[PDB]
Each structure stands twice: as C-alpha cells, then as structure tokens.
Design a protein around this ligand. Structure first.
Ligand SMILES: Nc1ncnc2c1ncn2[C@@H]1O[C@H](COP(=O)(O)OP(=O)(O)NP(=O)(O)O)[C@@H](O)[C@H]1O
Ligand SMILES: [Mg+2]
Lengths: 194, 176, 105, 254, 195
C-alpha cells in the first residue's frame, strides 16, 4: 500500500542515485589519493597543498576531481579492496565483518571501479564472489530467525545485506501473521504514537 | 503483494455448499450463481461459501482432493520427486486454511488433512530454498518453476528477486 | 516555541522562586540570540585567508574568562550591569559574575 | 615482527627525540620530561662488558611518585602497550616468588622444575610495577637483586641457578599519606628506603598542582579525548566486549 | 572538511528508517546555504583572478570548490525530497488533517506542498467516474466481511451512519457497523476493530 519508501540505493549501478540518502552516506566515506599537481589556497584543509601530497578525502570529491587523464590526483584503493583482503574474502566470506569494514561495502566497492584501476576486474570478481558466499547464510538467517533477537545475526552484515535481511524478515513475519490470522484485522497506523 | 492479497485471489476458487435456505439465481458480475435450494449441493466462490458458513446458512463440503488417501499419495509423490509436482489446487494452502478453520465440523479427518498439507508445504518450501541457493551459486540467468503456487512464490520471492537484482548488478558492473 | 509545545507552566501572579530569576535569564536569552546574529559572528569556512576575531567583535561569557585569560586585551562580554557592592560595580550573565572597573567608560 | 626510511626520517626531522617524546602517549597531556625519561627507558643504554670481566648494567630504571589522578598508571599502561615484552605487575597483587620463579610439577612427567616469574619473563624488556609503595619488604628483596645485578639467584627443588632478569623497571607509587605533603621533606613523603631508591636511575615527583591555566589545558585535552570516536564505529555505538577478530596468519594491510 | 554540516541533515533523516517525520532543521539548512554562499564568493573571486591575471594554478581549487558546492546542493535537495516522501505517506497512512504535534514539525512551505498535493489527489479521485469519483484512499486491505464490530478508544462526538441515523462514540461503547464507514476512523485510531 501507500507506505513511505526511501529512494532506492543505486550504488551498484554505473552511477549512484542522486537523491539516495544511502548513496550520499556511502560516498561520504574517505578514499586515499596522491595529488598530481599543487593546489593553492587549500592548505587550511589539506597556503598551497604541494605536489605529490598523500591525502584521504571523500569519494564524491575524488570522483569530482578525477579526470581519466589523471591530471589533478591519482586514486588508490582502500586496504579492504586490495589483494590481501580479497584473499581473506576468498577464504570464507561468512566470517568477515562488513559492518566494521565500511558499512556500504558493496556500494563503495562498485563505485571504486569508476577510477579505472588496473585491478578493476579483480575487485568486481571479489565483490561478486563475496556476495555469492554470504547469500546462503543471509537467506537462512533472515527467513528462519522468527520472533527473536536478530542482533547477532545482523551484526556482521553490510547495509545492502541488512536490507536483504529485513526483506526476508518482513516476508517471514507477513506469512506467520497470515497463518495465525492476525493479518485480517484493520488497525491504526504507526502514527497513533502521536 | 501481501499474503492477504494471495488469500483474496484464493477466495475466488469454487467450492460446493449445501444451503439451508431458499434463493433463486443471483446474477453476480463475475458470473451468475445458484439457484440455492435447501439441502442440495451448489457450487459457489469460496468467499461466499465462508461468509454463508459464518452466518450459519450452509454446510461446506470438502473438495474432492481433501481426502486422506489422495493427500498421502500426493505427499509421497512430492517427497519422492525433486521438481515441484502438480498440486491438486493452485491455492491449496489458502483453501486448507480457510476451509478447515471455518468448517472443521463439516470436513471429516481435518487433522490428517491439515498435517498432510503442512507436509507438502514444508517439502515444497525446502525445494524452493534449494532452487534459490542453486540459482545464486551457479549464477543462473533464469529458472523454471512450473508447478509452484502463488502463495509459495509470494512467501520467499521478494527476498529472492531483490538478491538476484543485486547479483545481476554486481556481475554486470564492468560493462564498458 | 509556544508554551503549549513545551514544559513551561502558565504564568500567574504568585510566581515561584524560579520565575523571578527566569525573568532576567530570558531577557539575557533574547538579547544573546539577538547579539550572535549580528556581523560580529565568526567568518565562514576560510572566509578570510588569515583568521579574524569575529569582525574584531568576538564574544565570550563570564565563566570563560574566569581562568587562563589574565590581561587578555580584547575580551568582549554580554552581561547585566549591577551595583552588587556600593561603588564596586559587577557584571552578571547566566554563567556567573565579575567586577567592573569602569574607570574609563 | 624498511630501515632505510627510518634512517631518512632521522635526517628529515629536527631533534626527532623531542617529536617522539611528545608523540609518546597522545592521550596524556603534559609531563614532557617524564615522557622523555620513559623514551630513554624504552631505548636504553648499552650494557658494557669490561676487560676485567665485570659488567655495567645498561637498563634504565624510572620511579614515578605522585598524587592521585596524575596519570602514573596510564603511563605504565602505555608502556605495556608500546614496548616489546613488557610485563604488568601491581604491588598488592604480586609476591617475591611470582616475581622471580616458582617450583611447579610438570604434569607430562611429574618432575618439578622452575617456572619463570615476572622479571625473568621480562628479560631484555620492561616490567611495570603499579602501587609499588604497597609491596611487602620481603617482596622487594627480590626486586633489589634484579635491579642491582640484572639477575636473580634461586636455590629450590634440585636447581641452584642465576636466572637472567635483565629488565628495565618502571615503577609507580603514591607518597606516604596518599597525597604529597609540601610541609614534609621528600625523604618522608617517599616511604621507600634510601637503599632501594639508589637503584633507580631517575625519580620523578609529580603533583596535582591546581593551577587554573594548567587545569584549563588538561581539562580541554581530557574532554577532547572523551569526545573522540573511532572512524570505523557508528555514531551511537557502545564498544563491543572482546571477541576473536584475526582471520589470517599474517597481517593484511601491508 | 566543508561538507559535515550537510551530512548532519542526511544523518538526521537516515537515523529514522521508520518513516516518521523529524522537526524541520531550519538552522542546519541556513548554515549549509551560508556555507554555499561563502564558497561561491570565494570561487568567483578566485576564478576571475585566474582568468584576468592569466594565472593557471587556481584551476584545481576552482574545481574543488565547484564540486563542494554541488555536494552541498545534492545533500540539501535529497534532505528536502526525502522529507517530502515522508510527508506524502501521511495522507495515506493517517488522513488529510494531520495532528498538531506532527504539524508543528513541518515547514510552512511543506504545508503548502501538502495542501497542493491533497487538492491534486482529490481532483484526480473525483475525475475517475461520472459522479462522486472513486475514493481510492479507502479499501487499503482486501475485504473480509461486510460488517465489523468496532470499539471506541477515544471519547468522541456524534458520528453519522446514514442521514438521521447516527451513533455516539463514547469511550468503551461498542458498535456493529459497515466496514467502509469505519475504515477511516480505525486507521485514525478513533475505533478499534475487534475479532
Ligand atoms: N595529564 C593528564 N592527561 C590526561 N588524562 C589525565 C591526566 N592526568 C590524569 N588523567 C586521567 O586521570 C585518570 C587516573 O589516572 P591514573 O594513571 O590512575 O593517575 P595516577 O597518577 O596513577 N593516580 P593513582 O593511580 O591514584 O596513583 C585517568 O583516566 C587519566 O587519563
Ligand atoms: Mg593510577
């Protein structure tokens, strides 16, 4: 029915959604870079920022400054997307804590491909295989954790996987309410709290 | 789509009732029904059957497939097969819930019928779980689910479709 | 906020001991929010390449200067004039009080 | 557990000892000379062997004496976190046996052997002793040999041996009467015996002097530290109680 | 970094997934707009300096402030639009006249938008048929029974059932009435559907 629905996240696509709060928060996360030419007047922030300076700045700003000729700055991957952590994911995707390793792991990784790194293919394959490995546990936990504390199950999941978990939980709760007949009652909305 | 809406579609299925009242043919928009003669079977949609049973105006008769022998055969066939088998009704779970919750007095051996329907439901939801896992593991592009019912698809399909959307975008993010 | 949207009680003649202080506290509050919206406010993010002291009108309260700021030559404070001792004037704000040497005005 | 960048950084930096000392324990404000002394303790001198066969002990021993709430325990904790092979110890929770060595039965065979104590485990390392003024005298008898000679002599079970206990001692104590008394001599504020005090390289008295400017900067630093939250943590998280989080035999961000 | 005040608007809305409407962050909106004004003034000064003087090294920081400005715009527009989404859900989940405790959270322009949306929606609903339209805000759940039993939660005034017939909605009184007449009051919480 006509319930409130957030603007959906478009982080996994070629470009993120403009009005998505999730995409905005995802792109806020910082990204290491190396500056290719000195920038005047910005020494107050990191008077000129000298050439060759290492910086960590937001992903939206890195994408804004980044032109494919690599004229202003060079963009480097975060550690969690480099080969060692990709190997960690290859070991067993179920045990890594993607909530602590950036809450928007898949969205940040997908937008990290925009900079045309030589290991873009490796990053993409790592993201795909991580999702494939974690899918079954997400599915079973979401669809079988009925009416209990879901904190331990949902703790290690990134925000995309948390959305999938809530979708599965919503389906489970809907079917259980149907089977026990509670779905037939007409009830006041959540706004009765006011 | 909600389970109540799947029940709403399931309520269109035809069942047989024995009225205890007299009423000539009534011309409904979806199709005329009746005449309703006392003590004689007449076929009506399930919503009207449940409403008349609630109002003490009829006795519901079970469908031909609500039979312990037939349901045991169907359950054993479902457990024996790997693919989803053809079900006796396209809304068998909702039919079972409505008819047994409202007319357990009319329907004999309702406990056995309910338990066998639950067995079939558990087996087929397990098969659907296996199908979803195989889909994601093998990175299939499409699946074939010929004999699934609408309630079975609705129970798990929102999660599965969202997960497959995410998987598709993850495996296609190198398009240039 | 109107009082119906708050915890504030209705006004009455036989006020509480709190209300007597609340008069002057609210007078300070209105003048304080009036004051900080004037051009004396601090510059925006690198509004000037060297930093500026709020258009040379940067503000402070009494409790801030009761401390390390001895003989700081540019203190500005909003507060109420009081002859808290005879001839020995004091300033007061909701944070505290301090003597006023007003030999030059 | 590369050196070339260190040997370049010592040229790029100007008086790198000062920068290291300032950066020693960021969470603790002030105490600059104490931080320099702790850095000296961490680095140490060079132990001499003389041609006559005598040796000169190279470790540096530091004793911090001071009022309640002047970060002595916190400096010990930082040294425990930063140094390789730093052993924690507290005065009331330790014994002369546990500091040096204990006879214990090896259940693989049943024979009894020496099991190393704190200062033997700390060999070529550091041992941090909090509440040092609360130790028993018989327990400090063990510390005397360790500090004086860099060894401990043991004669128990079947074994008679001089165990190596070459460790720097970083001890923390309160003065007698809890709070330091300005109207008493230091030798009476300090309840320890002069024989023991001779074994420490440096002795620091640090006081809770309630200067308003010093209080201003200290309180500002403390409240800034309490306001800090890590970047890999959500805006309203309580930190999780401990659980295993290491998932490769070698560290990944390298 | 510049953007953090804009991020507080975003974090305010993201910290309430349930769809309820927080108070309008007028002060935060004023601050991000002031920041954009300052950024634009600096950018204009720098860009005209660079173009008139022929000085080329300004162009990276020009692009820096330009991207920062576009970021500020994106954040505030997303904030306003998501607030509009939350407000739009109120017409369907509760009804037309919002309670004053919630109406106090809305901006005046938000109430303007909401009134325009209500007028447009009512116009669309009227135009669905020859006379009286179709009230699609009703029939939110599939129908089970023609009549329902309802219980009065709020002590409430006279409620017309049909013309001269009406029922007094005194608290704890219990009526048996048509579902389509009782649906709005149940959704508003005046009545409790039982059984
Ligand atoms: N200069 C300082 N900077 C930061 N925190 C400080 C400072 N001085 C004291 N504290 C805090 O005070 C608390 C107590 O520190 P602690 O190390 O136990 O003091 P102490 O000198 O050992 N006193 P005590 O254990 O009673 O002999 C800790 O939380 C410290 O962080
Ligand atoms: Mg301490």
């Amino acid at each position: 029915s006509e319930a409130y629905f957030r603007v959906e996240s478009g982080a996994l696509g070629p470009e993120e959604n403009f009005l998505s709060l999730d995409d905005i928060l995802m792109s806020h996360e910082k990204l290491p870079v190396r500056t290719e030419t000195a920038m005047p007047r910005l020494g107050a922030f990191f008077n000129a920022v000298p050439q060759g300076s290492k910086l960590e700045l937001p992903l939206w700003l890195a994408k804004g400054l980044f032109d494919n000729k690599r004229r202003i700055l060079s963009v480097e991957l975060p550690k969690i997307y480099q080969e060692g952590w990709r190997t960690v994911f290859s070991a067993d995707p179920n045990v890594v804590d993607l909530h602590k390793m950036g809450p928007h792991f898949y969205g940040f990784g997908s937008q990290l491909l925009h900079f045309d790194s030589p290991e873009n293919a490796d990053i993409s394959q790592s993201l795909l295989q991580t999702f494939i490995g974690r899918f079954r546990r997400i599915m079973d936990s979401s669809q079988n954790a009925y009416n209990e504390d879901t904190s331990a199950l949902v703790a290690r999941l990134d925000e995309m996987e948390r959305g999938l978990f809530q979708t599965g939980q919503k389906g489970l709760n809907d079917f259980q309410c149907w089977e026990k007949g509670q779905a037939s009652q007409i009830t006041a909305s959540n706004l009765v709290q006011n | 789509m909600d389970a109540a809406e799947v029940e709403f579609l399931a309520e269109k299925e035809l069942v047989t009732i024995i009225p205890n009242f007299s009423l000539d043919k009534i011309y409904l928009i979806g199709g005329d029904l009746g005449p309703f003669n006392p003590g004689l079977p007449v076929e009506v949609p399930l919503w009207l059957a449940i409403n008349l049973k609630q109002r003490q105006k009829c006795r519901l008769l079970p469908p031909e497939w609500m039979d312990v022998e037939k349901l045991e055969k169907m359950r054993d066939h479902e457990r024996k097969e790997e693919t989803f088998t053809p079900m006796p009704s396209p809304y068998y779970m909702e039919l079972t819930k409505l008819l047994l919750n409202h007319a357990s007095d009319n329907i004999p051996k309702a406990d056995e019928i309910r338990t066998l329907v639950k067995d079939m439901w558990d087996t087929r939801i397990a098969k659907l779980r296996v199908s979803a896992d195989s889909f994601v593991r093998q990175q299939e592009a499409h699946a074939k689910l010929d004999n699934l019912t609408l309630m079975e698809i609705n129970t798990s399909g929102t999660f599965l479709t969202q997960a497959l959307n995410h998987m598709y975008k993850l495996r296609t993010n190198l398009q240039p | 906020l109107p009082l119906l949207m708050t915890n504030h009680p209705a006004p009455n003649l036989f006020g509480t001991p709190r209300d007597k202080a609340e008069m002057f506290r609210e007078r300070y509050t209105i003048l304080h929010q009036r004051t900080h919206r004037h051009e004396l406010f601090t510059p925006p993010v690198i509004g000037s390449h060297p930093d500026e002291s709020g258009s040379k009108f940067q503000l402070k309260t009494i409790e801030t200067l009761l401390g390390s700021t001895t003989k700081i030559g540019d203190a500005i404070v909003l507060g109420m004039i009081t002859q808290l001792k005879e001839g020995k004037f004091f300033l007061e704000d909701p944070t505290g009080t301090v003597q006023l040497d007003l030999s030059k005005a | 557990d590369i050196a070339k960048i260190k040997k370049f950084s010592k040229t790029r930096s100007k008086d790198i000892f000062d920068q290291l000392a300032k950066s020693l324990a960021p969470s603790i404000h002030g105490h600059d000379y104490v931080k320099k002394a702790i850095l000296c303790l961490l680095l140490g001198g060079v132990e001499r062997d003389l041609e006559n066969g005598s040796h000169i002990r190279g470790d540096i021993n530091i004793l911090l004496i001071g009022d309640p709430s002047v970060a002595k325990s916190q400096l010990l904790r930082y040294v425990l976190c930063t140094a390789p092979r730093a052993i924690p110890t507290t005065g009331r929770g330790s014994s002369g046996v546990g500091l040096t060595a204990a006879v214990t039965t090896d259940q693989e065979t049943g024979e009894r052997r020496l099991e190393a104590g704190a200062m033997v485990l700390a060999d070529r390392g550091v041992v941090c002793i909090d509440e040092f003024d609360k130790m028993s005298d018989m327990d400090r008898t063990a510390i005397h040999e360790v500090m004086e000679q860099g060894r401990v002599t043991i004669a128990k079970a079947g074994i008679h041996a001089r165990l190596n206990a070459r460790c720097s001692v970083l001890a923390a104590a309160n003065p007698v009467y809890g709070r330091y008394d300005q109207y008493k001599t230091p030798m009476e504020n300090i309840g320890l015996q002069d024989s023991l005090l001779s074994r420490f390289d440096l002795l620091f008295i640090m006081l809770d002097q309630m200067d308003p400017e010093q209080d201003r900067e200290i309180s500002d630093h403390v409240l800034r530290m309490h306001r800090y939250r890590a970047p890999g943590e959500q805006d309203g998280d309580a930190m999780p109680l401990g659980s295993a989080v290491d998932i490769l035999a070698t560290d990944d961000p390298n | 970094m510049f953007c953090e005040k804009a991020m507080e608007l975003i974090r305010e809305l993201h910290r309430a997934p349930e769809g309820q409407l927080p108070a309008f962050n007028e002060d935060g909106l004023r601050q991000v707009l002031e920041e954009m004004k300052a950024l634009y003034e600096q950018n204009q000064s720098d860009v005209n300096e660079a173009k008139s003087g022929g000085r080329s090294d300004l162009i990276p920081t020009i692009k820096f402030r330009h991207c920062s400005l576009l970021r500020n715009r994106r954040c505030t527009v997303a904030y306003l639009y998501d607030r509009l989404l939350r407000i739009r859900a109120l017409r369907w989940e509760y009804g037309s006249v919002l309670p004053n405790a919630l109406r106090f959270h809305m901006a005046a322009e938000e109430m303007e938008w909401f009134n325009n949306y209500k007028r447009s929606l009512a116009t669309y609903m009227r135009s669905l048929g020859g006379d009286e339209g179709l009230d699609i805000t009703q029939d939110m759940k599939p129908p089970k029974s023609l009549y329902i039993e309802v219980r009065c939660l709020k002590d409430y005034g006279e409620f017309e059932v049909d013309d001269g017939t009406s029922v007094l909605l005194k608290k704890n009184s219990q009526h048996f009435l048509p579902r389509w007449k009782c649906e709005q009051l149940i959704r508003q919480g005046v009545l409790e559907h039982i059984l």
